[PDB]
Structure formats: C-alpha cells, structure tokens
Design a protein around this ligand. Structure first.
Ligand SMILES: CCCCCCCCCCCCCCCCCC(=O)OC[C@H](COP(=O)([O-])OCC(O)COP(=O)([O-])OC[C@@H](COC(=O)CCCCCCCCCCCCCCCCC)OC(=O)CCCCCCCCCCCCCCCCC)OC(=O)CCCCCCCCCCCCCCCCC
Ligand SMILES: CCCCCCCCCCCCCCCCCC(=O)OC[C@H](COP(=O)([O-])OCC(O)COP(=O)([O-])OC[C@@H](COC(=O)CCCCCCCCCCCCCCCCC)OC(=O)CCCCCCCCCCCCCCCCC)OC(=O)CCCCCCCCCCCCCCCCC
Ligand SMILES: CC(C)=CCC/C(C)=C/CC/C(C)=C/CC/C(C)=C/CC/C(C)=C/CC/C(C)=C/CC/C(C)=C/CC/C(C)=C/CC/C(C)=C/CC1=C(C)C(=O)c2ccccc2C1=O
Ligand SMILES: CC(C)=CCC/C(C)=C/CC/C(C)=C/CC/C(C)=C/CC/C(C)=C\CC/C(C)=C/CC/C(C)=C/CC/C(C)=C/CC/C(C)=C/CC1=C(C)C(=O)c2ccccc2C1=O
Ligand SMILES: CC(C)=CCC/C(C)=C\CC/C(C)=C/CC/C(C)=C/CC/C(C)=C/CC/C(C)=C/CC/C(C)=C/CC/C(C)=C/CC/C(C)=C\CC1=C(C)C(=O)c2ccccc2C1=O
Ligand SMILES: CCCCCCCC/C=C\CCCCCCCC(=O)OC[C@H](COP(=O)(O)OCCN)OC(=O)CCCCCCCCCCCCCCC
Ligand code: HEM
Ligand code: HEM
Ligand code: HEM
Ligand code: HEM
Ligand SMILES: CCCCCCCCCCCCCCCC(=O)OC[C@H](C)OC(=O)CCCCCCCC[C@@H](C)CCCCCCCC
Lengths: 535, 535
C-alpha cells in the first residue's frame, strides 16, 4: 500500500517537524520558463558531475613529486623517471577499469563548467540581471568564475605532465617571480623553495580537492539561495511586471524539467568522455625542465591569460638595480580584468544613474551601450584566446607565427573597437526592426493591387486596425515581436495522425479543436491577468 | 559616522533583499540556558578548530608511500627509509614554523571532538532528548559520532608511522581480511592489493580531508538545522512547559555567550597543543612491518574497539575447508554496537510504548531503567577502553598482563551488571531524596526543643505551611530541588566593597537592595507566567 505508506510518512514528518508551510512555499515558488535561464543550471550540473567524478579520481590519485620508474603496463613509458602523481594518473588511465573514462568525463565536465559559467555570465550581463537587487549575486558569481578558472588550472596541473608542467612553470613560477616587491617571496612561499619544490603538487591537490571546491560550494550555495529568495528575474511579457513572477511552479513542471535537463547534461558529458579524447597525458611524458612541446597551451578558460602573455609587447622596466619583467604587465592586466568584472554593476550604476529596483530583464538590443561593451569584451577575450592558440593556428592554417602574433597585438586594440561599433549599431537596428514591426505589422507575401500595378507586401497588423487599412501602431513593451507569420496563427495544422499513416478524422478534429481551445484559453488567461494588473 | 553607515547598510540589505522578518525570527529565537546544552557546542567548536588546522596541515602534508631517505633536520632519523607521508609529517613538526604546534592542536582538537561528542551523547541519552521528536536527530548524530571515530582513525593513521601503521595493520587489514564471504575482497579493494599497497595513504588522505569531513559537515548542518527549527528541548521548571522555550534570545545574550564559549574552547585547545605533547611521530619511527612497540594503542575513541579485540576469547570457527578468524567476532560486535546506538530511540519507544511528542527533558534519576542502561553501557565502554590500555596499566600499575586481560574478560559481563544494578538503585534513591525534600523541606542545623531534650533538624519548608509546624507536601514536578539553604536566600550577602577594602555604606545598600529587587522581579515574573499558563 504505497499510498498508505506515503500518507503515514507525511504525517510522521509533519508531526516530528512542521515543514508543511515551508514545503508548500518551495513547491509553489514560480520560476520563469525562459531557456536562457537554464544556462546557470548547466554550470551547476557540470559542477555536480565534477564533484562526483573527482571523488572517484581522488580514490586512485597520489599527489607527489617522489621520483619513480613507471614499471606499469604502458610500454612507451617504461623505466622513465616520473613523479608519483604522473604514475598514478597513468594508473588511473590504464590500470583501473574505467579510470580513463572517469578522468576524461571529469576534464570534460571541467571544460563544460567553465564554458557554461561564461555563457551564464554573458546571459546575465547582456540581460541586465545584475542591477539593483542582484549586484551582490553578480559579485559572488564573478568570484565563482575566477575560482573555477584557477581550480581548472590546478586540476589539469595535478597530474605532473609535460604540458601542464611547462604551463605551470610559465604562468605560476614566472609571473610570480616577476611581481616587483614580493614576487620572489610569493614564489618561495607557494613552492616552498625553487620552482620544482617537492610540495607543489601536494599543495595543489589540497587546494583543488578540498579548499577551492569548498569555497566554490559555499559560494554556489549562496548563489542559489539568493536566486531562490530574490525571486528569479524575467523578461518583459504579457502578464510579467516588476512585482510578479510568471512561469511554472517548482513541483509539477520546473522540478521535472530541471531534473531531466540535469540527466541530459550528464549524458552529453558522458558521451564526450567516451567519444572525445581529453588530455591524453600518456602521450605527454613526465614533466622535465628540459623537455618541451610546440603546443604548450592551457585549457580554454586560461587561454585568454596565456594569450595576454603572448601578445603583450615585451615591455620591461629596470629601476635602480632592479627589474620589472613582462610578467608583471600580465599580472596587472588580470587584476584589472577581474576588478572590472567584479565591479561592473557598480560601475554601470555610477555611469548611468540607475538605482531603481529592477526585476524585468532588458533585451540586449534594448540596452545598446551595454550590449556593445559586452560584445567588445567578448571580442577581446576571443582575440586573446586565439592568440594563445596562435601557435596551432599558424601551424594548421598557414599563417606566419609572427603574423599571428602581430595580428593579435593590433587587433586587441582594433577588433574591440570594430566590434563595439558594429554591436552598438546592430542593437539600434534591431530596435528599429522591432519598431517597424510595431508600426506596420508582420511581413508576408506580395500582392499586386487590382486597379493599378502597385505591389504591397500584405502585412499583418499586431494590434487594432484603424478604420482604413493602416493599423494603429502599438507601444513597445520590452518583449520580442513575432516577425514571421510562421510563429503566429498561420500554417500550423498538419494532419495529426502519425509520420507514416493518418488517424481517424473524428480523432484529428477532436484533437485539433482541443488544442485550439487550450491555446486560446492560455492567451485569454494571460490577457485577463495583464488587464487586471492595471485595469 | 558608524551609526549612519550601519543604518545605510541595513537599508541597503533590506532593499536588495527583504530579510527583516527572518532575521528578527532568528534574533528572537529563545534558547534554554542550561550548561549541559553547551556540550554539543563544544563538539561543534572543536570541529571548527579541526577544519582550520586541517587546512594548514594539508598545505604541508604529502600523502604517499614513495620511499625516501629523510635527509632532513631531525638527526635521530637520518638516512632511514621512510614514506613521503612520514617525511612530510616530520617536516611539519620540525622544518615548518609552528607546524608542530598546529599538528598538536589538530590532534588535541580531534580528541576533544570525540570526547565532547561522547559527552553530548551521554547528555541527550540520559535526559531523553531523542524520543518522539529529535529521534532522527539522534540517528544522524550517531552516524556523526561513527564518522568522527573513523575520521580520527584515518587522521592519526595519515602520517605513516610505526604506531599508527601497526594499528592499521591490526584493524584495517586483519579485521577486513578475516570477514568470511568477502573479507579478502574488501581488503584488496581498500588497499589496492596486499596490505602495504602503494595507495592506502593517498586513499585515506582523500577520505580524511574531503570525503568523510564533507559528510560530517553536511550532517552537522542537518543536525544544527534540526536543533534550530525543532526548538531546543528544556528541563522541567517554573515557567517551562512542553509548548514553550524558556531561556534567552539569540541576539543579546545567547550569541555573545556562545562566541565567548567558542573562544574559551579554542583557548583550551591551544593551551593543550602547546603545553602537552601529542603523537610524537619523530619518536615513533617510520612504519616497517618488522618493527613494533609495546603500547600499540589507538586513540581513546577507537580504544574500545581495540579492547574488544583484546578481550574476546580467541574463538575461531573452521567450516568446510575455510576459516572464520576472531576478527569477525569484533567486527560483528562493532556492527551490533553501532546498530543499537543508532536504533535506541526506536527500541526504547517499542519497549516502553511512549510515542508522545516530548519537549520537556526528564532528569536521569526520573528514568531509572534508562539511566541504568546508560550507566551499564558506559561501564562496558570504560572496561573496553581500559582493556585496550591493559598493557600500560599492567606495566605501571603492577598487575600481571594475563590478570588484566582476564579482569577485562570477566568484567565485561560482570561490571555492566553491577553498574546497572547500582545505577538503577542510585536513581531510585535520588528520587526518594527528592520526595523527602518535597515532603519535609530542606535540612538545616539541629535545635534542642525547650521543654524536653528532643532534637529536631529545624527544616525549612519549600511550600505553604500547614496551620501547625509540618508543611503541606508538594508534588514532584520533574525539576531539581534545593537541598541546601546555602543555595536559597540564606547567608548570601557579603560586604560588596572589594576583596581588600570596603565600599561606602550607601553604595553597598543601594547595590544589595537593587539586587534583591531584581531577584524578586525575576521570581515574580516566572511565577506569574507559570500561573497564566496553568490558569
Ligand atoms: C551548496 C550548493 C548546492 C545548492 C544549495 C543551495 C540551495 C538554495 C536554495 C534555497 C532553498 C531553501 O532554503 O528552501 C528552504 C526553505 C526555507 O525558507 P522558507 O521556508 O521560505 O522561509 C521563509 C523565508 O526563508 C524568509 O525569507 P524571505 O523570502 O523573507 O527573504 C529573506 C532572505 C534574504 O535573502 C537572502 O539573502 C538569501 C540568500 C542567503 C545568503 C547565503 C546563505 C546560503 C549559504 C549556503 C551555503 C551552502 C554550503 O533570507 C533567507 O531566507 C535566507 C535563508 C538561508 C537558507 C539558504 C539555504 C542554502 O523552506 C524549507 O525549509 C523547506 C524545506 C523543508 C525541509 C524539511 C523536510 C522534512 C524534514 C525531514 C528531516 C529528516 C527526515 C527524517 C524523518
Ligand atoms: C554546515 C555546518 C555548519 C552549521 C550550519 C547549520 C546552521 C543551521 C541553523 C539554521 C538557521 C537558519 O537557517 O536560519 C535562517 C532562517 C531561515 O528560516 P526562517 O527565516 O525561520 O523561515 C521560516 C522557517 O524556516 C520555516 O520553518 P518551520 O519553523 O516552519 O519548520 C520547518 C523546518 C522543518 O525542520 C527541519 O526539518 C529543519 C532541518 C533541515 C534538515 C537539513 C537541512 C540543512 C542541511 C544543511 C547542510 C549544510 C552543509 O524546515 C525548515 O525550515 C528547513 C530550513 C532549512 C535551512 C537549514 C540551514 C542550514 O532565516 C534567515 O534566512 C535569516 C538569515 C537572513 C540572511 C540574509 C541576511 C542579509 C543578506 C545579505 C546577503 C549578501 C549581502 C551583500 C550586500
Ligand atoms: C590572434 C589571431 C586571431 C591571429 C590571426 C590568426 C587567425 C585565426 C587567422 C584566421 C584563420 C583562418 C580563418 C584561415 C583561413 C584562411 C583565411 C584567413 C581566409 C580569409 C578569412 C575570411 C574573412 C573568410 C571569409 C569567410 C569566413 C568567415 C571564413 C572562416 C573560415 C573558418 C576557419 C571558420 C572557423 C573558424 C576556426 C575554427 C578557426 C581556427 C580556430 C581554432 C582555434 C581551431 C582549433 C582546432 C585545431 C587547430 C585542430 O587542429 C583540430 C583538429 C581536430 C579536431 C578539432 C580541431 C580544433 O578545434
Ligand atoms: C554510552 C551510552 C550513554 C549508551 C546508551 C545505551 C546504548 C544506546 C548503547 C548502544 C551500543 C552499546 C552496545 C554500547 C556499550 C559500549 C559502548 C558505549 C560502545 C560505544 C562506545 C562509544 C562510541 C561511545 C560511548 C561514549 C560515552 C558516553 C562515554 C562516557 C563519557 C562521559 C559522559 C564521561 C563523564 C564526563 C566527564 C566529566 C569526564 C572526565 C572524567 C573522566 C576522566 C572519566 C573517565 C574516562 C573516560 C570516560 C574515557 O573515555 C577515557 C579514555 C581514555 C583514557 C582515559 C579515560 C577516562 O579516564
Ligand atoms: C600557529 C597557528 C597556525 C596557530 C593558529 C591555529 C589554527 C590553525 C587555527 C585556530 C586560529 C583561530 C582563527 C582561532 C579563533 C577561532 C574563532 C573564530 C574564535 C571565535 C571566538 C571569539 C574570538 C569570540 C570573541 C568574544 C565575542 C565578542 C563573542 C561574541 C561575537 C562572536 C565572535 C560570535 C560568534 C558566534 C559563533 C560561534 C558562530 C558559529 C557559527 C556556526 C558554525 C554555527 C552557529 C550555531 C551555534 C554556535 C550553536 O551553538 C547552535 C546550537 C543549536 C542549533 C544551532 C546552532 C548554530 O547554528
Ligand atoms: C550495554 C547494554 C547493551 C546495550 C543496551 C541498549 C539496547 C536497548 C536496551 C534494552 C532493550 C531490552 C528492554 C527490555 C525488554 C522488555 C521485554 C518484555 O518482557 O516486554 C515488556 C515490554 C513492556 O510492556 P508493558 O506493557 O509495560 O508490560 C510490563 C510487563 N512487565 O513489552 C513491550 O512492549 C516490548 C516487547 C519487545 C521489546 C523488544 C526490545 C528489543 C528489540 C531488539 C533490539 C536488541 C536488544 C538488545 C538487548 C541488549
Ligand atoms: C559555479 C558557477 C555558477 C553557478 C553554479 C551558477 C548558477 C546559477 C543559477 C542556476 C542561476 C539561476 C538560473 C539562471 O538565472 O540562469 C543563477 C543566476 C545568476 N547568476 Fe549564477 N551561476 C554561476 C556563475 C555565475 C557568474 C560567473 C556570474 C557573473 C553569475 C551571476 C548570476 C546572477 C546575477 C544571477 C541572477 C540571475 C537572475 O536573477 O535571473 N553566476 N546562477
Ligand atoms: C569544482 C570544479 C572542478 C574543476 C573545474 C576541476 C578541473 C579538473 C581538471 C580539468 C582536471 C584534469 C583531469 C585530467 O587531466 O584528466 C582535474 C583533475 C583532478 N580533479 Fe578536479 N576539478 C574540479 C573539482 C574537483 C573535485 C571536487 C575533486 C575531488 C572531489 C577533484 C579531483 C581531481 C583529481 C584527483 C584530479 C587528478 C586526476 C588526474 O590527474 O587524472 N576535482 N580537475
Ligand atoms: C559532530 C558531532 C556533533 C555536533 C557538532 C553536535 C552539535 C549539537 C548541538 C550544538 C546541539 C544543541 C545544543 C545541545 O543540545 O547541547 C545538539 C543537539 C542534539 N544532538 Fe548533537 N552534536 C553532535 C553529536 C551528536 C551525537 C553523537 C548524537 C547522538 C547527537 C544527538 C543530538 C540530539 C538528539 C540533539 C537534540 C538535543 C535537544 O534538542 O535538546 N548529537 N547537537
Ligand atoms: C572532522 C574531524 C577530524 C578529525 C577527528 C581529525 C583528526 C585527525 C587526527 C587525530 C590527526 C593526527 C594528527 C597528528 O597525528 O599529528 C589528523 C591529521 C590530519 N588531518 Fe584531520 N581530522 C579531522 C578533520 C580534518 C580536516 C577537515 C582536514 C582538512 C581540512 C584534516 C586534515 C588533516 C591532515 C592533512 C592531517 C595530517 C597531519 C599530520 O600527518 O600530522 N583533518 N586528523
Ligand atoms: C605593470 C606596471 C608597470 C610599472 C612600470 C614602473 C616603471 C618604474 C621604472 C621606470 C624607469 O624609470 O626605469 C628606467 C626606464 C625604463 O628608462 C627611462 O628612463 C625612459 C623610459 C621611457 C618609457 C617610460 C614609460 C613609463 C610607462 C609607465 C609609467 C606606465 C605604467 C602603467
């Protein structure tokens, strides 16, 4: 009697505790059903998969520089001195059932985590979800992005590899020693000595499996709690206002679709871990200061920092008996990048004057200057990433390596400007298109007038039509406009039988008019609620 | 202008979010001011100290069996083959400033964590803080205690050491490998092969810094949330009923005293980390299977398991072509111990029959059978703990080792029974003392009656006095009774000047009169609230 068991368990729960009101509030919480609001969930799900795979990895990983000869199964690396970290990474890859798959899905989850964090940041920035109520949310999310970047750095640096080791040597060691007053001291504190200090990988292992994941988990908890209680913002729409949330309740629909989305994201990541090879360390010999490779790139989320290193033009200053190497330039650049990213909402409000409580998102077209600035920043980030990749770009796409370096150097001040101008004008022209639709109706096929030979596109008005043909223009309300009669009530009733065979006409008619009734009922309910809010 | 800044920040917080109601609820939440209710806070604070010191230790610890010759600073161990775990533990002790102190306070915090969990368990069990509500809280607390035990077990085993490695070889290897159907399979899957498998310490490091502490943190969060929202139970008292919480609000008093208690607990832990030596791994040479000491004990929380191993009388079974070693006996004993501890509230409710929602604790004397059972269990635990120490007990206190072993063997069935009987009768006699105090008043000095030589103790009634001398007996109300006029308004007003010199008579009179007025006001407030509730 599962129904009786459920009832008895509910009564016992509500007697021991009293979660009825709280649970009802959680279940009844309404979440907007916009697709772009799942971008953060992608990052959350990738993070969960990262935790689950990282536990498995830590069950088999040994962090240490203790030198050992492999003497494993992988023949191409036998008798070669390597760190125990590399040896156990190879053991995970080869000598544990499914360890290669687990580590590959872990790395793919890391890449998807960074990518989805970037996409979510783009969504919120361009939609203006950081304004008065949620600047703190933006700030903690920026800290979260920085932590994710650096944890991925430490994660692919954990198995001491040739690629990851040379990346560490460059970024960490060089840029740390570069810092003027405390650079060498920071280097010695972090590595416990010179660069190959025998505590580096244990320290990174701790930072990567316990410390940084703990901070990220706490910050994700704060992030999700803030989103939960500062009810999720929404785009302007029929019944959507600054003081309501139009969407679906948590329990019946949102919970089911979020769980299913998590399942599908897990499936995508597992499929990638299977079919796509990620970081094949066995091809990469154990780290040695002398051995190198041509590629020498970090993961894509640090590729922009590496590209900054490459592109910045070797400007070194030599104060009285001292040196200020080119690494400090990039250190300051990264500092500026993070500072501006964290402080943008406050910069935005200082610049514009907006101190209003904003609960309705802005369309990126509707906010041109911010959209232009975001496009400019994305262009700069892409230029830096492809500059880091300039080695492989030059190799495959036959471009001189010097040519790619200087393309990056010039474009990091030219391409941002071009993209800013283009994005600003593009946003304004999207606004112009929206107003054209508002004032003339949707466009359709052309018709030749009866008496004379005029051609008229035979538009379709979206609002009340004047006594004559031309309609009364509507007022823009911040919501997208249907520019195709495709997406309106036109040409949308295929035979509802099946792909290969029809259904009885009675069934088809019943279904089609039932759907018509349901959709017009939804439209009428939204219209009535909209009229009720002010009217 | 700190006041202006605070007001502006409060307005900003209440504009960005709306936490006024929730924050007021948290601040107004009332917590009983009983000392025994700080026992859980001791464990919580020790856990926090453990986390803070563990982060520092992970910054310097390298988990690996990779053999290395020390070549460090500690001369008595130079050129000796040791694992990287032992080498880096020695480095923490010697070649890192304050590292010895940090690891010592970490281990002392672990010991206090276990001890305070045990004391909190005693408090809740004896006061009945688990029945009907909070039974799941007790269950998760039992899981938490088990996790803490094994967490400390992996912790002091983390630096590969002679003592701790011998303890691992005994328990983790022998007990695991003796289990009949899957013993060797569990052993090989935990150790990645034979006992000295090259992954044991890395696996324990993962389990001990991330996995088990993560679960402990999650369960502590659940525990504290349950205590918070299932308002803390309280002892019977003047104004205390099953439907109210008499105490002090969170903000002014409870928060400050809890923070001060945290400060004092961490001060005790730091003082002991300094002044008392814990786990001198430098004295305890590196683990070698051929070497061993005579002590060979685990920390006091696993000492009862070790004592069970020692005392159990070498009963082995040999089925058809198989062996069932004595390790399975102790394994099943531990399983039974944990199962009974976890399932006691449900066992108690099944036995007695009480499923009523209990919010008022019951004094351990008021429940003779349960206090008797708890005393019996504590006696058995102490017997096992001292059996584990029988080696040093025999060495120092001159008692033959066989005599100590057999004293433990006989006592573990005799001592629990003796302690059960004694505790049962002691509880009933405490009840009898309470009743005699209720019906005769408190005792005082003796007086010789005027006409005849009668001697009468000259009691002092606690309630209304009959027309004649003897008082109207009161009814027991589940709350402690004052058995000394000492603790009542009798001889308690010393000159309020100072230790060395007096104060002016006017000031002393003002102070004492104000104090007496405050006592009257408090007692009258309690009395009036009690009357209002029960009338
Ligand atoms: C970690 C990462 C993983 C993800 C986790 C993050 C998830 C966050 C989502 C939040 C959801 C939530 O908390 O809902 C709970 C929600 C609590 O809030 P509520 O009920 O709406 O109360 C009124 C409002 O809270 C009153 O609030 P308001 O609407 O007036 O606005 C005030 C708001 C102001 O807004 C804020 O500032 C909120 C943001 C908080 C900042 C950071 C706090 C979170 C940090 C998390 C760190 C994690 C590590 O302040 C808060 O409410 C703060 C609450 C903090 C809880 C955060 C939880 C995490 O309700 C419940 O408790 C429902 C669940 C019931 C549980 C019992 C079920 C049965 C019991 C069985 C026990 C054992 C069975 C055995 C038999
Ligand atoms: C980790 C270990 C470390 C220790 C952490 C544990 C501490 C737990 C203590 C709980 C205290 C608590 O949650 O109070 C919050 C409390 C939420 O509850 P409430 O407000 O009473 O709401 C009505 C009741 O919750 C309605 O509840 P009810 O009284 O009707 O009974 C229903 C109850 C049923 O009872 C239960 O079953 C509760 C037990 C929950 C089970 C396990 C959940 C917890 C798991 C934690 C795992 C951690 C890892 O269900 C719940 O309420 C569950 C709530 C779960 C929250 C647990 C928090 C942890 O109020 C607040 O949110 C006040 C804080 C406001 C924060 C905003 C401050 C300003 C915002 C600034 C943001 C950024 C500034 C930048 C500018
Ligand atoms: C710092 C910086 C950006 C310096 C400049 C270097 C650079 C990126 C130059 C452009 C590269 C191109 C497009 C070369 C083709 C020749 C060329 C320049 C033609 C004119 C360009 C132009 C305006 C054309 C008009 C039409 C048009 C837009 C054509 C674009 C054609 C292309 C290539 C579109 C896709 C863009 C693309 C993928 C560029 C390469 C970028 C990267 C990082 C590829 C990474 C990558 C590599 C390198 C693999 O080898 C590989 C092997 C197996 C599986 C996966 C991959 C993989 O993902
Ligand atoms: C223990 C209890 C209340 C049980 C309830 C009944 C029940 C549900 C039993 C279920 C399971 C079974 C089979 C239990 C029997 C054996 C048993 C308890 C096994 C599990 C052991 C375990 C994980 C926890 C038991 C914890 C417990 C409550 C211990 C007593 C601790 C308390 C409250 C002591 C009094 C507080 C106080 C002021 C202490 C300081 C004074 C001193 C020094 C007391 C004596 C003392 C103690 C207590 C040491 O632990 C110790 C350890 C190492 C060296 C020396 C000593 C020592 O001298
Ligand atoms: C060589 C070397 C490395 C040396 C250092 C050693 C090392 C590695 C680490 C230790 C170093 C440190 C940082 C030590 C200090 C630790 C620390 C934070 C101490 C704080 C205590 C302190 C300084 C008090 C000052 C006096 C004062 C004005 C106190 C009032 C204001 C304060 C501080 C209030 C704090 C309140 C407090 C304890 C909050 C804890 C937060 C948590 C985790 C839970 C809150 C909480 C509590 C506390 C409950 O009791 C409770 C009971 C029932 C249900 C729920 C709860 C609940 O949720
Ligand atoms: C260190 C020490 C070891 C650790 C100690 C902790 C373990 C729990 C402690 C004790 C359990 C045994 C209690 C005593 C059980 C009483 C037996 C009885 O005869 O039943 C009478 C009851 C009163 O009913 P009544 O209407 O008040 O009538 C008055 C009649 N004269 O009946 C009932 O409801 C209940 C009947 C069935 C009870 C079954 C309880 C045990 C369940 C299995 C769990 C394992 C138990 C392990 C035992 C160590
Ligand atoms: C670990 C990284 C992150 C996780 C797990 C995460 C998760 C989420 C989720 C699930 C949401 C609600 C759904 C949505 O709005 O799409 C959200 C909202 C938000 N995120 Fe994050 N995000 C992360 C990174 C970031 C970054 C890099 C920023 C900058 C940021 C700022 C915000 C803001 C301002 C909101 C509020 C949006 C709204 O109210 O609708 N987050 N986050
Ligand atoms: C939270 C975000 C995280 C990110 C972005 C991340 C990223 C990465 C990446 C990219 C790798 C390289 C894997 C490879 O080269 O095969 C890695 C390795 C590793 N990760 Fe993480 N990780 C995260 C969380 C965790 C957690 C929570 C744990 C532990 C529970 C963990 C444990 C490990 C271990 C042990 C390795 C080394 C395994 C190997 O070398 O193959 N990671 N991490
Ligand atoms: C990490 C271990 C533990 C921590 C941090 C902890 C913490 C706390 C705290 C602070 C309280 C409230 C204050 C008090 O009642 O003294 C509490 C209550 C409680 N604890 Fe624990 N405790 C732990 C272990 C245990 C164990 C081993 C049991 C069994 C247990 C069962 C309970 C119960 C039933 C309560 C409710 C008491 C009440 O409501 O008055 N706890 N715990
Ligand atoms: C949760 C309860 C915990 C308990 C009961 C506990 C217990 C212990 C004990 C007794 C030791 C032995 C120290 C020594 O012999 O000097 C130890 C070592 C260690 N603990 Fe924990 N610990 C806990 C949590 C943690 C946490 C959260 C971390 C990391 C943040 C951590 C990290 C370490 C490290 C790295 C060592 C090795 C230190 C050494 O070898 O000297 N522990 N632990
Ligand atoms: C990372 C931040 C980088 C901070 C550099 C701090 C430089 C301190 C030492 C400068 C110096 O005097 O050394 C001798 C100099 C090299 O030779 C000359 O006397 C003529 C040099 C003409 C070029 C001047 C360009 C100055 C630009 C910076 C002021 C802008 C920094 C932003």
């Amino acid at each position: 009697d599962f129904a009786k068991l459920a009832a008895a368990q509910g009564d016992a729960i509500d007697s021991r505790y009293h979660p009825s009101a709280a649970v009802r509030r959680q279940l009844n919480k309404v979440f907007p059903t916009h697709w772009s609001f799942l971008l953060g969930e992608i990052a959350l799900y990738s993070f969960i998969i990262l935790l689950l795979t990282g536990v498995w990895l830590t069950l088999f990983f040994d962090p240490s520089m203790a030198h050992v000869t492999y003497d494993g199964v992988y023949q191409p690396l036998r008798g070669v001195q390597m760190s125990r970290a590399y040896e156990t990474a190879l053991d995970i890859s080869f000598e544990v059932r499914g360890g290669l798959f687990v580590r590959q899905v872990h790395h793919w989850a890391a890449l998807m985590f960074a990518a989805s964090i970037m996409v979510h940041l783009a969504r919120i920035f361009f939609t203006g979800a950081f304004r008065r109520p949620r600047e703190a949310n933006w700030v903690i999310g920026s800290l979260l992005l920085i932590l994710a970047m650096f944890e991925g750095f430490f994660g692919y640096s954990l198995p001491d590899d040739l690629l990851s080791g040379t990346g560490i040597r460059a970024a960490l060691s060089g840029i740390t020693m570069g810092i003027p007053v405390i650079g060498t001291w920071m280097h010695w504190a972090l590595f416990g000595g010179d660069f190959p200090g025998e505590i580096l990988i244990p320290r990174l292992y701790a930072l990567h499996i316990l410390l940084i994941p703990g901070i990220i988990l706490a910050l994700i908890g704060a992030h999700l709690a803030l989103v939960w209680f500062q009810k999720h913002t929404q785009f302007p729409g029929p019944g959507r206002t600054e003081t309501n949330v139009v969407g679906v309740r948590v329990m019946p629909v949102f919970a089911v679709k979020s769980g299913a989305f998590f399942a599908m994201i897990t499936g995508v990541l597992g499929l990638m871990g299977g079919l796509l090879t990620i970081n094949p360390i066995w091809n990469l010999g154990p780290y040695k200061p002398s051995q190198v490779s041509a590629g020498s790139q970090p993961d894509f989320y640090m590729m922009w920092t590496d590209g900054l290193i490459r592109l910045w033009p070797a400007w070194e200053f030599y104060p009285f008996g001292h040196t200020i190497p080119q690494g400090v330039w990039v250190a300051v650049g990264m500092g500026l990048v993070f500072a501006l990213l964290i402080a943008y909402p406050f910069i935005e409000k200082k610049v514009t004057g907006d101190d209003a409580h904003h609960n309705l998102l802005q369309r990126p077209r509707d906010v041109p200057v911010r959209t232009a600035i975001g496009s400019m920043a994305i262009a700069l980030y892409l230029l830096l990433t492809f500059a880091c990749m300039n080695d492989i770009i030059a190799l495959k796409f036959h471009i001189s390596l010097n040519a790619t370096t200087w393309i990056g150097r010039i474009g990091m001040v030219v391409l941002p400007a071009i993209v800013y101008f283009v994005a600003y004008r593009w946003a304004i022209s999207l606004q112009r298109s929206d107003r054209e639709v508002l004032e003339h109706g949707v466009e359709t096929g052309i018709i030749k007038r009866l008496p004379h030979g005029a051609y008229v596109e035979l538009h379709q008005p979206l609002g009340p039509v004047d006594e004559h043909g031309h309609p009364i223009p509507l007022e823009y309300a911040g919501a997208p406009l249907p520019k195709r009669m495709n997406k309106l009530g036109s040409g949308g009733a295929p035979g509802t039988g099946s792909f290969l065979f029809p259904d009885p006409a009675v069934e088809h008619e019943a279904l089609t008019e039932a759907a018509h009734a349901s959709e017009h009922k939804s439209l009428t309910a939204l219209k009535e609620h909209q009229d009720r809010i002010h009217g």
